[PDB]
Design a protein around this ligand. Structure first.
Ligand SMILES: *C(=O)[C@@H](NC(=O)/C(=N\OC)c1ccco1)[C@@H]1NC(C(=O)O)=C(COC(N)=O)CS1
Length: 261
């Protein structure tokens, strides 16, 4: 029984854990706290890039964006390296997904445009995909329970499913998004750690205060059967400085993989 295993992990890591895997041909949906709200953290950057791709011709990826000192307000491993030259939209998408770059995400939000520095248009994009649940309210750089900047494992899984496996994006734009997630550098110790090496994993991570650790993935079996895996967690019991625990997500993913293999 998965629910007992998930509950066991919650006690181990003094955590709240949310899990959703959408149903397939032969597997029922896996769900644990799947309709509870958890902070997006950086996981919004995957649908954000989808929004930017959708909104523009593909050659918009070549548009150079300039930025300066006061735009670097959050963890931005790539954008800090290129502040003196600027970065193209394509480079920003790359950084936002593969390095979870905060500045890159803010600039992409600004590119999408509109009220709240792009957060309203980003939320509008999710609504267009039938997601009435998620909301983005602020930029990089939220107390536990607060509904601002939250999604649910259920909602974000269905969004990722449409983006990667469905037809939310035309194939050419879909492949750009899928490739960036495939080449992600931040996810080795999360969902990836729970699935055997002969399963393909693409993902976008999220990490925050109050022990927040997320990962959203699409995985493929050795025979090419895809599954969407959304795992979210926080550790409110440790306060603001509670350490995020990647191992919680690795273990949750291992339990899921055991059911799907
Ligand atoms: C997105 O989740 C974002 N994280 C942050 O910007 C955080 N603090 O600013 C409010 C934060 C808190 C703890 C760590 O960062 C970026 N994303 C990610 C990510 O995992 O996607 C990280 C991850 O660090 C890892 N791998 O442990 C930090 S920056």
């Amino acid at each position: 029984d998965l629910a007992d295993r998930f509950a066991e992990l919650e006690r181990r890591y003094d955590a709240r854990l949310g899990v959703y895997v959408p149903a397939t041909g032969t597997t029922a949906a896996i769900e644990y706290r799947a309709d509870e709200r958890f902070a997006f953290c950086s996981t919004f950057k995957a649908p954000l890039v989808a929004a930017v791709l959708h909104q523009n011709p593909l050659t918009h990826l070549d548009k150079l964006i300039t930025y300066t000192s006061d735009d670097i307000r959050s963890i931005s491993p790539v954008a800090q390296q290129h502040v003196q030259t600027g970065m193209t939209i394509g480079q920003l998408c790359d950084a936002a997904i593969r390095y979870s770059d905060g500045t890159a995400a803010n600039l992409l939000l600004a590119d999408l445009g509109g009220p709240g520095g792009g957060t309203a248009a980003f939320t509008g994009y999710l609504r267009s995909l039938g997601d009435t649940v998620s909301r983005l309210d602020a930029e990089a750089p939220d107390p536990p329970g607060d509904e601002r900047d939250t999604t649910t494992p259920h909602a974000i899984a269905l969004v990722l499913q449409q983006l990667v496996l469905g037809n939310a994006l035309p194939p050419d734009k879909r492949a750009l998004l899928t490739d960036w997630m495939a080449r992600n550098t931040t996810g080795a110790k999360r969902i990836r750690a729970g699935f055997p090496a002969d399963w393909k994993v693409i993902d976008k991570t999220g990490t925050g205060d109050y022990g927040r650790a997320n990962d959203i993935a699409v995985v493929w079996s050795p025979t090419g059967v895809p599954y969407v895996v959304a795992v979210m967690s926080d550790r409110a019991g440790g306060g603001y400085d509670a350490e995020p625990r990647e191992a919680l997500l690795a273990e949750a993913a291992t339990c899921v993989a055991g059911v799907l293999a």
